[PDB]
């Protein structure tokens, strides 16, 4: 189950302050799109109200945004991925001038941001996540029917808006949020593939997502599975390390490599 | 050869309508998410049952084609394949929080979803499907004139809307539905080819199709034959295993490899 | 000459029937487009009247659609080849529930559909077509001035609409129709080339064309010579066999390989 | 150097007008089929004959350029992209001739009417072979830098594709031996995905459509075709072009490497 | 860690305003030339000086971010595609300086005004070289993950390209040693067909246009440029970048592998000078 | 300095006759665009008027078009680079029926047109141009701050319109005009790269530019440095020789190869 502590209740006000304090946007190959902070606040309030209906114990099924919110839109005519970058402009989510809030998960003293759980298909990513990492909230997206779907920690989403709502919303409150998988986004990323058989904007998106979590004191682990050649995975993992607060590589059911940006410094394996 | 409607099928009609109304679904490829009109599937089920009532329950595949039973066969209610992912949004069909309904076909105790019948051209996919699999309903799409077209189990469709209508409609009632083949969709998949000489959205589509069947308690076998190199088929089959409930590989008229997600767990050969 | 037998006259009524009974469309990378059946019927009527005015012995020049019909259009604002597959939908011409009508040409007991006469430039396709296959009607499209143009069996077309009119129109009556060539359609196929250096929709088009002939009891031989590498022709011929009722490979002025789907079964060489 | 108008040319004027009016033609590339205004070609022929009459039959290539003789040089009669559905634009190929083509003595004996492609790498001797070995009656110069051939009285300097077809169909139908050096402005602007041989497939369709356009109007034209292709891939492309033209000439190190001509005595390879 | 405003900076304010008004500039990429609103840069300089005055000369990078000081951060003043005819859009390059450019002591001695490009593969030590060896006065942080450099009082966190140019031209003209870590948000969103070296050709034109923009406004800027390029094509890309900037530094294995600086003493390739 | 001789003053009338006599246009991948001859005439008049106010000694800074003309536009709604060639038409600047005016620069007896100074980055193109070629007017465009910018012969431009104005305007008068560089145009050439890793229209543009100078009796040297592989430069240089009146290749600070079309014939090294 997903148990709501007094620590989570005390973070509600702070979470609302963090969201209102900084206006954020996101961009991919098109034009920068603003994130409606209000929706995340509304989600937190809905989760707290339901938590109150129960004994603080929540079922992942009951906290899905499609059930709690009338509208699940976070992004507020249509632009092509091959338009002039000077007509659309360029946006990256700004960094934190202050020291980021540290966490005990996925690693000790890790800064707020995003961790990428990498590896080839069947390398043990989902296994490593649920057995070794053991998240408080397990977001399930674009993955076939598995044993992890029967878990009361599992929250089934359909859109990118829903992913960010649950990640920012619950992550800000102090929950250890995880996403399995981020394949719906990755496999629909349109554009010319750069060095490593993957679009360059993929690395920019990971940085923008990481900083979005750093700003809202979230500690999120995302399963990032790329359609990349068996030997080109090492290059891509090195490139992802420069774009995320955390990075975990899986090979043959075990953890091959690690990288974490902590209060004790950047730790490699 | 005939398609017989048992009392078991009649008793599932109400449940099928209940599953369809309970969850609103959509589908996305490289464009924008498009909603699926559930009502059309319900209307199809009612038309099949009405005809089964007039006949002895012994129905001919020719008489149950949607173009004949329905006035309009549309299930989806103009965007380029190279448009910003943030302007269209991303959609994946949500997972099942509950345990999926098990089936005896194509394998014992297999969960509801999709099975991909893979193999090179002339590897014996169509032969394995009809002789070894023995499906109740055989959907024939984008295939040249063969002996399987003269079968009373054969239902000849033209559109993707029709495929989903027959698959969800009859599959929900408990019928063992099969599609030979899904080639018109695969060969019209526009986009930049990823690792393995195939567009990445192909794997996302298989998962979205699988989850669509998992949600509506369907057990469907689709023969998937995409344009891929003779040696690159092993990589693609491994990737498809991570995107479907079932996977069957054909080589020299026989079954080379198998993967099934059952109540007894994931079974490899 | 092109001689009209009583057997052809007796098929006129059956041809109008077949054409009215099933509404057909065609799709490539755009949106599905309906085929106006009336135009084919109008063409048959104009050919029969001219055959009745002359001695039954017609000249290919006199039966060209541009001469017999006021308008040659078969297809009834503008869509790009890179448009979302979900916005246009997917269409494949439906298969035949009944047994297809057999023919003695290009092979004994062959089912109605299309035969692809394949080979590199100067492999002997056009020689094999005119000397070994001996067609009744020879449609000449996208080819330079050759000896075959002076033939009384030769009918010179300009559009794809005209090709289908003569193929379906005369083919349905029992004539052995051949197209030399289909290069104006192949070389103008816009899209990203799949495995084998050729667009995947090419194989779907051959199946759709074949089934169009299977439905209207036609036996058509099309010379198909797409821009493909000298060594990649074997792979492409292999994929074409899985997309057509007949397949003939030319090399060094002679027949290299054959495949025919007959009443006695699929025959390979 | 001069362009002389014989009685044979004068006697063909009526026949040329008949050939043009008899068959309506179009052209297509990656967009939609575009009709060719036959009237413009007839108007050009009339202007050339009138000037030939004022002179002694002896004409200067400079004086017979379409931009000088016609007020409007347009042959093709809102805007479509090269990546549009083939089914929405339709497909057009210029129809073949049911009758025997009109044979010529140039570039080869008994060669049928149509187009000949003068191929070869850059500096292989295409322009040299064209002017020294071929000896054309009319030399169309297009998209080529300043050379000795521009000072020739046979040289007619054009700017558009419309102008090329006007001079090719107009003068070729009358019986003149017309040549184009070169067709690089069309080839280098051919938009589309490059097929096998590092060149767009529609290139081969265009050569056939151009060939048949000349076959129908009994024109004997030699076009120097030099597309951007790899040094070793030229052999493959030349073989493919042979299947798309009435004539084909390959140049290598200033000399003629290979030949192909479709004649009344049959197809002749070297 | 702090950003100190000297009398030298105060004396440059007028000079900077004149430089901006004297020459009208634009920028182009694959679309239509877009004009740069000089007024916004002047307004930013005035806001920085006014705040420097309220504080004791010393300023915090957080307080000088354009989003905080200006009501609108737009520098570029309907929508054109990256694949439009070059003749329908025309071509624009920022013009060169007819006079001798203002020399600087940073990033190299006697260097001309313009842009310096700090190259290297990922984890080659670009950010380390920038902060330890180069020591910039103002550190612009853009599209980079949470690092130790973000806690620095020299760090100014931006989000747009408009903001980058405002801080670079605005503070750089006054005499500050401005650095950008990273320029990746721009590089990773460069739409177009990749040329030789697995990178769009307009990338090199943009570096030259950015360099000349700084040469005209007497700025000395160091931009860290991380290219999505294969391990073996980095040498080719660097050679090409050297021909497009006033300064270029290559990083490999935590150290400086190669340098190029256009100084008053001439073009110096791989000099004996610690940064 | 830039000195105006009596020879230049005597050419003013002839330059107007040349510009008025032939209407010209330019095309790239879009539609043909007319060149407004009047603007070039206006520029010549402004240069001569200023040369008069001076002692015949002009500063390159004072003769820049942005300073002398109110509007710098030469080309007189918006078309895509991937539009049908038949809808835009094709334009090449026409050749000269007469013998071209000869020059003593960059080579003895060279015909009027364009010379391409080629070579890898840092091969010594700019060095060869200013030390060995010694041009009368050095147009500086899209190049970084160098010693050549402080030269009184240097004229700094921003647009392609400005380049052609100075090249045609001053070149027609007899000045030895050079451009360092043509990179702003070359690095913004949109389209599919042909053989040699460069767009085919690049070679057509060089010929069109060369013929534009041949028609207006100009002798211009352009630094052409396109993004091409280290080994592919030899192929491209050979192709450029077939597209220009002059061609110079640079390697390791020295001149590797030369080609000039003179009154004494085509001279190779
Ligand atoms: N093709 C295969 N054959 C055998 N076992 C496999 C195969 N693919 C995966 N497995 C098993 O599944 C485990 C990985 O499961 P999982 O965590 O779901 O992988 P991932 O999330 O990376 O796709 C492996 O350690 C192995 O035991
Ligand atoms: N090229 C070939 N040569 C010989 N036999 C072939 C060939 N291609 C297919 N076959 C025969 O057809 C069988 C496969 O039929 P089928 O099930 O229709 O294949 P698929 O559906 O995979 O295309 C093979 O087992 C073999 O007996
Ligand atoms: N490159 C060539 N060299 C020599 N003869 C050739 C060549 N190409 C074709 N031929 C001749 O033409 C014949 C093939 O003719 P044809 O059927 O028209 O070819 P295609 O396969 O292109 O339709 C060959 O048998 C040979 O006699
Ligand atoms: N790179 C070169 N080196 C030496 N001579 C050359 C070179 N390129 C061309 N030539 C000379 O020019 C002749 C070819 O001239 P030309 O007919 O104009 O060629 P093309 O029209 O095929 O481009 C060759 O036979 C040779 O004498
Ligand atoms: N894969 C790695 N394994 C070990 N150390 C690494 C790795 N990647 C980077 N480092 C360390 O980080 C340093 C580079 O840090 P940084 O300046 O942030 O690089 P950059 O800015 O070029 O991405 C290296 O000198 C090395 O000590
Ligand atoms: N990577 C380098 N290493 C050393 N010297 C170089 C390098 N690149 C250029 N140079 C020097 O600069 C000279 C070339 O200068 P320049 O004319 O500006 O070249 P270009 O115009 O072709 O880019 C060379 O002759 C050499 O002395
Ligand atoms: Ca998994
Ligand atoms: Ca099959
Ligand atoms: Ca042939
Ligand atoms: Ca030539
Ligand atoms: Ca860094
Ligand atoms: Ca230079």
Numbering used by the authors:
A (entry chain K), C (entry chain I), F (entry chain A): 2 to 77, 84 to 276
B (entry chain J): 1 to 77, 85 to 276
D (entry chain B): 1 to 77, 84 to 276
E (entry chain L): 1 to 77, 84 to 281
From the paper:
The lipid-enveloped bacteriophages of the Cystoviridae family infect Gram-negative bacteria, mainly plant-pathogenic Pseudomonas species and share similarities with the members of the Reoviridae family, including bluetongue virus and rotavirus. P4 proteins are the only known RNA-specific helicases belonging to helicase Superfamily 4 (SF4).
As for ɸ12 P4, and other hexameric NTPases, the nucleotide binding sites in ɸ6 P4 are located at the interfaces between neighbouring subunits. The ADP phosphate groups are bound via the conserved Walker A (H1) motif residues (K132, S133); a conserved glutamate E150 (H1a) is positioned to catalyse the nucleophilic attack on the γ-phosphate, whereas D187, a conserved aspartate in the Walker B motif (H2), co-ordinates the magnesium ion. A sensor motif detecting the presence or absence of the γ-phosphate of NTP and modulating allosteric transitions of the RNA binding loop L2 in response to ATP binding and hydrolysis was identified in P4 from ɸ12 (N234). The equivalent residue in ɸ6 P4, N232, is positioned to contact the γ-phosphate of the NTP and might fulfil the same role. In ɸ6 P4, a much looser stacking of the nucleotide base is observed, with only one side chain (F275) stabilizing the adenine ring.
